[PDB]
Scaffold this active site. Structure first.
Site, PDB file in Angstrom:
ATOM      1  N   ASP A 197      52.023  16.484  47.930  1.00 52.52           N
ATOM      2  CA  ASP A 197      51.890  17.099  46.608  1.00 52.52           C
ATOM      3  C   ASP A 197      52.965  16.731  45.587  1.00 52.52           C
ATOM      4  O   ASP A 197      53.294  17.536  44.727  1.00 52.52           O
ATOM      5  CB  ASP A 197      51.789  18.625  46.723  1.00 52.52           C
ATOM      6  CG  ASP A 197      50.382  19.092  47.051  1.00 52.52           C
ATOM      7  OD1 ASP A 197      49.811  18.615  48.062  1.00 52.52           O
ATOM      8  OD2 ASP A 197      49.845  19.927  46.288  1.00 52.52           O
ATOM      9  N   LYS A 254      67.616  21.125  38.034  1.00 51.20           N
ATOM     10  CA  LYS A 254      66.490  21.961  38.425  1.00 51.20           C
ATOM     11  C   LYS A 254      66.937  23.158  39.268  1.00 51.20           C
ATOM     12  O   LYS A 254      67.816  23.055  40.123  1.00 51.20           O
ATOM     13  CB  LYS A 254      65.426  21.153  39.184  1.00 51.20           C
ATOM     14  CG  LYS A 254      64.014  21.669  38.904  1.00 51.20           C
ATOM     15  CD  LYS A 254      62.991  21.346  39.970  1.00 51.20           C
ATOM     16  CE  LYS A 254      61.979  22.486  40.119  1.00 51.20           C
ATOM     17  NZ  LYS A 254      60.889  22.172  41.093  1.00 51.20           N
TER      18      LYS A 254
HETATM   19  N1  LIG Z   1      63.569  14.152  36.729  1.00 51.19           N
HETATM   20  C1  LIG Z   1      62.923  14.587  35.665  1.00 51.19           C
HETATM   21  N2  LIG Z   1      63.112  14.041  34.505  1.00 51.19           N
HETATM   22  C2  LIG Z   1      62.491  14.462  33.442  1.00 51.19           C
HETATM   23  N3  LIG Z   1      61.636  15.446  33.433  1.00 51.19           N
HETATM   24  C3  LIG Z   1      61.361  16.078  34.540  1.00 51.19           C
HETATM   25  C4  LIG Z   1      61.996  15.684  35.749  1.00 51.19           C
HETATM   26  N4  LIG Z   1      61.557  16.477  36.688  1.00 51.19           N
HETATM   27  C5  LIG Z   1      60.696  17.298  36.113  1.00 51.19           C
HETATM   28  N5  LIG Z   1      60.571  17.041  34.839  1.00 51.19           N
HETATM   29  C6  LIG Z   1      59.782  17.748  33.836  1.00 51.19           C
HETATM   30  O1  LIG Z   1      59.792  19.128  34.102  1.00 51.19           O
HETATM   31  C7  LIG Z   1      58.486  19.631  34.125  1.00 51.19           C
HETATM   32  C8  LIG Z   1      58.457  20.713  35.158  1.00 51.19           C
HETATM   33  O2  LIG Z   1      58.747  20.152  36.419  1.00 51.19           O
HETATM   34  P1  LIG Z   1      58.433  21.104  37.634  1.00 51.19           P
HETATM   35  O3  LIG Z   1      59.055  22.375  37.185  1.00 51.19           O
HETATM   36  O4  LIG Z   1      59.071  20.510  38.831  1.00 51.19           O
HETATM   37  O5  LIG Z   1      56.940  21.052  37.576  1.00 51.19           O
HETATM   38  C9  LIG Z   1      57.647  18.458  34.507  1.00 51.19           C
HETATM   39  O6  LIG Z   1      56.316  18.546  34.047  1.00 51.19           O
HETATM   40  C10 LIG Z   1      58.347  17.403  33.754  1.00 51.19           C
HETATM   41  O7  LIG Z   1      57.966  17.525  32.395  1.00 51.19           O
END
Ligand SMILES: Nc1ncnc2c1ncn2[C@@H]1O[C@H](COP(=O)(O)O)[C@@H](O)[C@H]1O
Ligand SMILES: Nc1ncnc2c1ncn2[C@@H]1O[C@H](COP(=O)(O)O)[C@@H](O)[C@H]1O
Ligand SMILES: Nc1ncnc2c1ncn2[C@@H]1O[C@H](COP(=O)(O)O)[C@@H](O)[C@H]1O
Ligand SMILES: Nc1ncnc2c1ncn2[C@@H]1O[C@H](COP(=O)(O)O)[C@@H](O)[C@H]1O
Lengths: 315, 298
Positions: free
Chosen positions: A237, A111
């Protein structure tokens, strides 16, 4: 043998190079009896300038910083992750699907986070670690495997690596992001194949996950410890990420897959697919669910409230 | 296989770290079909800045620069040296005794000046081309790598070459041949003598002389053309009898001790070691030098 670090973007090549580099260096660093206070404020930094050399994939100039590398190494270990496996997942082939990346083998999620996120990680790191020691790595929380800062073209990018919530193999056919706080999916979101559905979406379609009493008990006991842990740290959140895998549907998808080319089932290693649980024997559809808490960098009421919802999700 | 980088001085730890790092990096770089002009102007620079991490043997902050890494890697190959072995020799244990050798005594680590580094760049292209043409068969110093280390804001330049002497067979007497040894110098566990001392002593018997000389000359005419001079012939002598499961008397691996030569059947039992060193009127120098060296081979 040769690792080329080829990738779609120079920032991905540097990510691969830096994980490769920091892990190899860590292999020359003894594994300590215990972590010391300084490890929680430590970092490694390397600045590279390759002139007229080794530039087919990497930029000539870049910087790679790794935060608290001894701590994240210990975390990997506690999460049952070998350093060479970790390094290989990131370096053998380019991370994919870009930022929210997956390693090519889908084991780890990378991320892109803010600078404020990096600061929060430092703030919570000691207590996160201790919480990990005492629950023996048994938790629905995000499992933080590494935290990095990349510099390419004078631009800084911060990344956190976690374990994928989803099965590195099994296909996800429906997914939800649940909070429980007084939230639905847009017509645009639903526009995409795997829309991310939300609380009112989950409740509306009368959804329920039958996992069996023992699994339900264990899950709810983790959830409880986890959400109270986040409460004490004043964190708000976060969500429960819920994936649903339809066993029969995937089996058919595979058959169609094979036919197009030529032109177990619902099984997983609880060791690798760490949040996966099977549907209750006496369940309508044969399924596998993936459930985990996400986004705990960006109180008491949120915990209890968010806890009740997730509890009423299972049967 | 934890490589600590433990050494007597921080500079040697950095050297060990840097050779380890650059060799490992190079294993991810394809061997090219040829060297290009740019490779002779290339470098790798890395600056390390660790905070509260991994500073048990290494300083927290240092820089390491490798000059023309593609060229020196091609040189290592043309000299019959595998990169992993070269990497292992520098890195497995600290270099010992600036004039160092690796812990296995195969390679010599020379501290040199900035101007030395300038001169190496000046001659590198021709030195390489000559190594190609002589098929690696030469008495010249074998230049294996060249580095600049920054430690405590201080820059140190180093060249790695092959040891002229065996990495095992003990040297019992050596000469620097182009003059004699000083009083204080003649009083050493293993002092270095010179042309006069050699002439006076009356000291080298070999098959091979022809071929050594065919080598000597080719090299020296090369050095003349470069207008280089003041280089010497470093000669070592292993007295077999004095030295006398295991390796036996006078036994050596010629692929490793590249300059070693056993004494002739009809000789008063010695292994000699001979190579040109320190190359960083030159017509006259060459022919004089070349003349003096022919007379030592019976
Ligand atoms: N550890 C994770 N494993 C798999 N998918 C994830 C994970 N963290 C986030 N996501 C996916 O990434 C999308 C975006 O995450 P975020 O950008 O943090 O909202 C989320 O809706 C999930 O589909
Ligand atoms: N040891 C630390 N403790 C707390 N916050 C930090 C620490 N190191 C970096 N940060 C924060 O993380 C973000 C990125 O820091 P930097 O690594 O200097 O780019 C900034 O918000 C910093 O203040
Ligand atoms: N055994 C099966 N179970 C469920 N759906 C199937 C099965 N075989 C074919 N289908 C579906 O029937 C349609 C025709 O598929 P096909 O026989 O592959 O051309 C597609 O929508 C398939 O997904
Ligand atoms: N390639 C070499 N192998 C072994 N010893 C050497 C080599 N080059 C120089 N030396 C020795 O290193 C010492 C000092 O070198 P220098 O002052 O640079 O000539 C002298 O004892 C030389 O005999």
């Amino acid at each position: 043998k040769v690792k080329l670090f080829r990738a779609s973007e120079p920032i991905l090549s540097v990510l691969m190079w830096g994980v490769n580099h920091t892990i190899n260096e860590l292999s020359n660093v003894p594994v300590p009896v215990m972590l010391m206070p300084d490890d929680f404020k430590a970092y490694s930094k390397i600045k590279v300038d390759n002139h007229l050399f080794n530039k087919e994939n990497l930029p000539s100039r870049f910087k790679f910083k790794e935060y608290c590398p001894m701590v994240f190494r210990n975390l990997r270990e506690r999460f049952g992750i070998d350093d060479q496996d970790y390094q290989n997942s990131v370096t053998r082939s380019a991370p994919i699907n870009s930022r929210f990346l997956t390693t090519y083998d889908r084991r780890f999620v990378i991320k892109t986070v803010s600078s404020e996120d990096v600061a929060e990680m430092h703030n919570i790191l000691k207590k996160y670690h201790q919480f990990i020691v005492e629950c023996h790595g048994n938790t629905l929380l995000p499992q933080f495997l590494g935290m990095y800062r990349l510099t390419v073209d004078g631009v800084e990018t911060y990344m956190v690596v976690t374990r994928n919530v989803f099965s590195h193999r099994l296909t996800v056919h429906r997914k939800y992001d649940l909070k429980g706080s007084t939230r639905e999916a847009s017509d645009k979101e639903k526009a995409k194949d795997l829309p991310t559905f939300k609380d009112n979406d989950f409740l509306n379609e009368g959804q329920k996950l039958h996992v069996g009493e023992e699994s339900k008990k264990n899950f709810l006991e983790k959830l409880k410890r986890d959400v109270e842990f986040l409460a004490q740290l004043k964190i708000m959140d976060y969500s429960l990420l819920v994936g649903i895998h339809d066993v029969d549907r995937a089996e058919q998808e595979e058959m169609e897959v094979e036919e197009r080319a030529e032109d177990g089932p619902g099984e997983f290693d609880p060791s690798v697919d760490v949040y996966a649980m099977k549907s209750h024997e006496s369940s309508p559809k044969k399924e596998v669910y993936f459930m985990a808490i996400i986004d705990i960098l960006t109180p008491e009421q949120y915990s209890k409230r968010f806890n009740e919802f997730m509890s009423n999700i299972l049967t």
